[PDB]
Amino acid sequence: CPRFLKVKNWETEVVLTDTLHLKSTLETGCTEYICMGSIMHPVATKDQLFPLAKEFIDQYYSSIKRFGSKAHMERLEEVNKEIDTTSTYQLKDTELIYGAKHAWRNASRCVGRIQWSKLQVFDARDCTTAHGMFNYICNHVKYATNKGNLRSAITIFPQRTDGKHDFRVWNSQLIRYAGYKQPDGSTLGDPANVQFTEICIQQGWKPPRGRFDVLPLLLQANGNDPELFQIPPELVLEVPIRHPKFEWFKDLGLKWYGLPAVSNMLLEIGGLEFSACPFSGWYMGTEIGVRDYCDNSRYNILEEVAKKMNLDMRKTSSLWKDQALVEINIAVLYSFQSDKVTIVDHHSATESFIKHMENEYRCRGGCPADWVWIVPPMSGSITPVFHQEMLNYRLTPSFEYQPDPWNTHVW
Amino acid sequence: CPRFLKVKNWETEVVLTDTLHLKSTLETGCTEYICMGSIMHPSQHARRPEDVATKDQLFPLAKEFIDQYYSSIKRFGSKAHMERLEEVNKEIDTTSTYQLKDTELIYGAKHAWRNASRCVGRIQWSKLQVFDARDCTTAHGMFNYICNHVKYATNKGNLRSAITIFPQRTDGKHDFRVWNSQLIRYAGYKQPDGSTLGDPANVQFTEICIQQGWKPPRGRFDVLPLLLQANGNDPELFQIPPELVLEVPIRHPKFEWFKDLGLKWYGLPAVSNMLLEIGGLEFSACPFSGWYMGTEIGVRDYCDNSRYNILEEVAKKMNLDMRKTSSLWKDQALVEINIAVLYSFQSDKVTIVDHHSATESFIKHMENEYRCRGGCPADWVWIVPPMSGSITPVFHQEMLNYRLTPSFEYQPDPWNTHVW
Amino acid sequence: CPRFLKVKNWETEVVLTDTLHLKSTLETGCTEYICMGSIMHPVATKDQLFPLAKEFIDQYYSSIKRFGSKAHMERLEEVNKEIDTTSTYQLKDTELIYGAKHAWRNASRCVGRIQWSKLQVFDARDCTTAHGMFNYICNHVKYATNKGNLRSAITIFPQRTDGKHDFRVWNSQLIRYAGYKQPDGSTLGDPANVQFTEICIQQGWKPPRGRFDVLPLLLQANGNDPELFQIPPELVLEVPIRHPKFEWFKDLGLKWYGLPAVSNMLLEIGGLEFSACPFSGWYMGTEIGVRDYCDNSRYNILEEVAKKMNLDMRKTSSLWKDQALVEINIAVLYSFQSDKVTIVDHHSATESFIKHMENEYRCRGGCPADWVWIVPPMSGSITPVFHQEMLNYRLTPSFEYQPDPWNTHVW
Amino acid sequence: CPRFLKVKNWETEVVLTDTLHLKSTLETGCTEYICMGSIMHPSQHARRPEDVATKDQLFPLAKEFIDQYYSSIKRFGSKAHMERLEEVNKEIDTTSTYQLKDTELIYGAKHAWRNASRCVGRIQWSKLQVFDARDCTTAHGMFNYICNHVKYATNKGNLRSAITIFPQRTDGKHDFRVWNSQLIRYAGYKQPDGSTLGDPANVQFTEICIQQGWKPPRGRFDVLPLLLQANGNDPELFQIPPELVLEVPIRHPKFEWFKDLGLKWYGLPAVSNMLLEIGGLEFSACPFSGWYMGTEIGVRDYCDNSRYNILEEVAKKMNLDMRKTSSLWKDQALVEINIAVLYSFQSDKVTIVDHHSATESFIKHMENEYRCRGGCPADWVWIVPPMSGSITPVFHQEMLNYRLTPSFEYQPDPWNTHVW
């Protein structure tokens, strides 16, 4: 209603038909009179949980081609008695694996979804303490890093109960660099992490006060006050950034970590909420080269690089920023590759994503996709995704945003 | 339910409050469940293009526009307001259409620009020369008006914004249409090769011209003739006098070989296929022009695979290693082409703006608009330039897209409608 | 989007879930800001036809559980080549029958749809003249009347081609009574048929000028001027109306016809348009007893029945109209039953409809229904449909309104 | 796209033009693809019931209301309009709420009635007594105010329309609520045999009253106590003084046995569980009353299968042959019950309107409203009486349903939300 929606690719003229949108139950934020497409961010009762669980179990049994089976019916009744009796329920291991992979399949902001079914799921639902969380995270980091040959993984901690016993990873990613405000108002290190760094120091962390200090983990188990743990340094793979032609590039002393491991999202499956679910894949180069290094509110290196390149910086129309941007991005890829650390460039990644989108239309009837996030932050129209119409809608299971845990926790 | 909305800039932390969206009366194409922000022409439950406005459609649309006009000149509820409303109503009542005052037409055109959510150039919105061509009756008359537009707008390279507005739709059988999609564009030809010579965007229009008896030079940059439909008649061909057509040969400030590619482009971007809607009145022929942002030429026109597709050519001449995507050879060539376009336009003293300067001005305009008007409708997908997105400030700026009227709207290609 | 909608019955508290709304492709007339639920009325190119034909053939092949065959793929190719070469296509007999039955299944205004699959389809696509049409119409009337034991039926004339060659039955129903404007402004016979009656007279029909004159058929074949034909009187089954207790009722000289045969609708199947498609079932009593007899702008008999009942008519609050209404409706049912002519009362009809709706939710995931038309025009809340929430949406194949032919027709 | 819409009456052929729907700012629940005209509580994308308006929600809602109010007293744009708007804005920015003037509250209440698309009684809309109870602070104070209401409105059978308006919502933790669905209603009791004694609609509410300590007489027509929530505290029980409760024993003008059924009803329909929204302010306790239309009692209260369900018992005493549905025995009994209700109220001099008189007046009202206001929102599903539909003129009248504010809205039963 409408049944069929069409997307066009403006380079190939290929028109595709979406019916997967019909499975949407959650709202996007837009209305018929306003589009919120560029806005970054536009305790279940028994009664609410029943339908959400049924819908999930239903789709699970359908996916394994056993819809209507007595297994299907019995699982439904078991779940139903479980909710009725404890006001919640437990996923079977198979359901949790399915839910996690599908939350990734459904993530409309992820260009990496061709890999969605190749995902190692660590089931940490028996975890009870922050030291326990630390151990699981270390196994995840070791497994995922794999000496540079990165492998996708998610570690899933106990689901929410009453909301007073939440497991949380206070870090926004498992591995990030510290940020300190300087007396003159500038920032040393990564300005994105200034608040989180302050919390860590406040909690007792001794800060080395350099540019690329790996943050410790701040871990909350069962709603208890969070605890600090240092990731053993031999587990954190880093790459020093050099350039294949500019010998001076290494002199900038840039580096970055190999494993991008988002750790502050909420994974929702059949109405159940996994507030601690760090997951990791591998980098697309522009995430580091364009955003991390060249955002004005991040490491902000364009000007230094341009100076070393001896560019004429007096006029914006010389495109000195653009020129430097490319060199930086060349260096990031070249450095990761030289060190045998899995990375993908924005051309290869977006081309793969288009193939994935086409497979998804053919087998699933569509592929929810957020064009604003999917198109890379540089060279947008010389990647195929710029020219591809897309439709954005929300399927469950899904990854969602949740408030920072310091905004809620009582000590 | 009505509410004020906040937009945040994620670099500056500046948060702005949108109140203007509350005035929107036209649909965006999204729903609560499905966002259609990246669809180029979403369905927006508009009435069929071939239909003309009924009285019941016209009355509210004319009242809303006249109210907004009298409100804008600080004369809302005045005797003149009331009398103008009465006159407009009698006209709709007795003829089922009305005529705009010249002042209203000028106001309408500037506001349609002010309201164009896809336009990054709107800081310039009130500086618009409006050529009122509503007395035009023939295709030759149209030609004359268009030659004036081209001459005034071009201004020997010192480009000036302008719009020329032909007679409004009546019964839908006497429409004025400029068949060209822009006043000045290059021909495209399907070759015996299978390849395309010239601009592939213009292949169908080119065949129509040829079929109308136009003699194609069959080169890579043939300026297209005008094909102009007056009063609903079959369209007629006219060659723009070549001396009115300002072109720029493309060269690079450092690469002496770049000029050997034999690239050029025209100075005057003049969109000619859109419909201007003011108070329910439809101006189906309303060519308008400003000046280029360099990426329009250097990224899209030159580097789209379905356009001139010059990336490989240029990368070869640059002696780049093209074996792997990860060398970013495409991105290197792209920066150089875009340098050359800006340099070539600046050297010939033809107005151009680069994507950094254009987007920085847009941010400034947005802020002025939130302060003086309560918002600025903007389509992020179109506003963020097609290269270097996040090293421009608009990438980091949340925008809200909504449709205000007066507006510029798309309309079907006339060869899809026209019976000969 | 949303995938699930709920309807509640406010007498039983049963909640049903609708998913059939998802197959909707056509608009209703409402918007998010206005409801047009009580508004009575709120040629296809090659490019339009391809998708409409595909959607239909797909749903047909899915209905016979052969989706993705073999026969399905070839039928699609055949249809596509047909549209390609001729800008139109022909339905198989199978698909025509299926389409006709589904148009009835989908008609949200019809309370009689429990019967939807028991429909006799007379395929009149080989018809070419008005006399041909007359013949097919005589067949339909005779078969559907069946001496009082009415059988549902539809006769389908050739589809529209260029729009200049339309088949049309100018009558709104095959059997209806003439109406005559009188010099003093009153009307003799049925006021609803005055315009059509004048046309007939203008075409040289010699009018009896009584209260219940059965109209001639006015039939347009192949876009030609329409022609007059008298329905052989022996084919026209009528019922004199008398009352089981009031011996004086028969003296009112009332009668009606047995066969309600709507003849002015358009049947749309897979993008094809059948502009002449008379169809019939049998009456619900209130149609005659409440609407045809008691509408102020119909036979308007309330006051004279009330007079004969000797009711105090001086105050609305005596409910003299309501009493008369019930008595007239009793007489209609009693008369049809006494003469063994199929009829259904509004309790039995609406009860069957709720049972049908429940069947449709179980097997099809919903049942579009227009509450405004489904609730009988008397005694609303003492039928179960009044208490039943319904969703209205438009499914194809469908029956649609079309303009009176005498507005368009060039003589 | 905005347009004027036409509604036709299919008996009288009168066509009216609706312009008022263009003012609507709240959703109906339908979409372009799915009509929800018969859903009792469609979801309309309202904010969560248990949230309170933010500044960003309140600023435009308050401006819209104050504009309509000053426009109504022909004072739009005046100094007073501007200064009132200024004062409201300071209050919102400073306390994130505001207070209505007495005149604004009275205007708001009357227009909420005028705007109630499901009410057939709106010809009466401007004749409404407003009891301003915004100074109330206790459950006992609520009781006193409600006693005042019942006494004023009943007026010894000569019923007068009234509303009593308790303090608006603040943080949502201090809500005033009448837990009763109407001020006067009959208890219902589930019986060991599975039947219900008294009124099944009130079983759950009755259960709560007994749990709270009310001693149930356990009969068929027990007048329920008030359960009153002040300032978000647990609610308190209060019996209405029985001399304030006017009741009518039902007898028939021809059937001597009718009185033997021991039926009665109360004179005063006082809906007490709705929320009154004025300018984004929320009056969660606002009991209002007019007088009955006969069918509300005769058809629904007495003949719904899930209410008193009296049909078969009446038909038996009428000696009807109940073996077949097509004898229309149910329809005959229905009419007689309805005659009895009207006759009884009229004999006792208690205001009542029959459904012919009520709907004929409503048609007149719609016509007045179209003439003076440009429309009348109306929900046909609710307006058409539950018996004899098409022998009332509203059945034949096309209606447009849309939502204007101020308005009366549904809110959740407080026992689903309340923390003890």
Ligand code: HEM
């Ligand atoms: C395996 C290689 C992968 C690649 C190359 C990749 C690529 C990306 C990129 C480039 C983004 C945008 C990042 C940003 O701008 O902040 C993204 C977002 C995202 N990806 Fe992936 N992805 C991968 C794997 C995964 C995995 C394993 C998951 C989860 C199981 C995942 C879920 C997400 C989600 C939820 C987002 C949105 C995050 C947000 O809103 O901040 N992706 N992906």
Ligand code: HEM
């Ligand atoms: C003065 C210099 C101007 C600049 C630098 C500018 C910039 C731009 C750019 C870059 C686009 C996107 C073009 C594309 O991707 O195809 C655009 C679109 C547009 N601009 Fe401008 N603009 C200017 C003047 C104008 C004028 C004079 C008008 C009309 C009065 C106008 C109305 C529009 C409209 C309606 C669009 C959307 C076109 C579409 O949908 O395809 N702009 N503008």
Ligand code: HEM
């Ligand atoms: C079998 C016995 C049937 C019964 C008892 C029945 C009942 C009804 C009734 C009472 C109406 C409302 C009529 C009015 O107010 O004018 C109606 C409408 C309708 N029915 Fe039936 N129906 C029957 C068979 C059929 C058949 C055979 C078809 C077509 C195959 C059909 C399609 C329709 C349509 C399209 C409408 C709406 C017509 C309009 O908008 O004017 N029904 N039905």
Ligand code: HEM
């Ligand atoms: C003058 C006497 C009045 C009459 C005869 C009358 C008539 C009616 C009727 C028959 C209903 C349908 C009730 C139902 O089916 O449950 C109704 C609904 C309504 N009326 Fe009135 N009305 C009157 C006065 C009022 C007053 C004084 C107000 C408020 C100030 C009001 C506001 C409403 C509202 C909001 C509804 C919808 C209630 C709901 O959704 O349950 N009416 N009216």
Ligand SMILES: C[C@H](O)[C@H](O)[C@H]1CNc2nc(N)[nH]c(=O)c2N1
């Ligand atoms: C305002 C805008 O939505 C915001 O800058 C977005 C744009 N697109 C993005 N795309 C990706 N992949 N990641 C981001 O952080 C952003 N930021």
Ligand SMILES: C[C@H](O)[C@H](O)[C@H]1CNc2nc(N)[nH]c(=O)c2N1
């Ligand atoms: C699919 C997508 O909407 C389409 O390619 C858009 C993207 N953004 C654009 N932005 C501008 N300015 N111009 C365009 O033509 C486009 N094309």
Ligand SMILES: C[C@H](O)[C@H](O)[C@H]1CNc2nc(N)[nH]c(=O)c2N1
């Ligand atoms: C205005 C209103 O929609 C119109 O009177 C409708 C109401 N319901 C109906 N219901 C049926 N079945 N038939 C009708 O003709 C009508 N008329």
Ligand SMILES: C[C@H](O)[C@H](O)[C@H]1CNc2nc(N)[nH]c(=O)c2N1
């Ligand atoms: C399902 C349906 O909407 C519901 O039964 C409505 C129908 N019309 C009504 N009409 C009025 N006046 N009052 C009601 O309670 C109802 N109930």
Ligand SMILES: NC(=[NH2+])NCCC[C@H](N)C(=O)O
């Ligand atoms: N490829 C991924 N899995 N990315 C997740 C986000 C990493 C983030 N963009 C960063 O630069 O650190």
Ligand SMILES: NC(=[NH2+])NCCC[C@H](N)C(=O)O
């Ligand atoms: N700056 C403008 N006014 N542009 C209008 C569109 C021009 C178009 N993008 C082109 O490259 O030809």
Ligand SMILES: NC(=[NH2+])NCCC[C@H](N)C(=O)O
């Ligand atoms: N039951 C049917 N098939 N009805 C078709 C409509 C008949 C119409 N209502 C009449 O009174 O004549």
Ligand SMILES: NC(=[NH2+])NCCC[C@H](N)C(=O)O
């Ligand atoms: N006329 C009114 N004010 N009605 C309000 C609703 C009364 C309700 N219908 C009842 O029967 O008790």
Ligand SMILES: [Zn+2]
């Ligand atoms: Zn959107």
Ligand SMILES: [Zn+2]
């Ligand atoms: Zn609706």
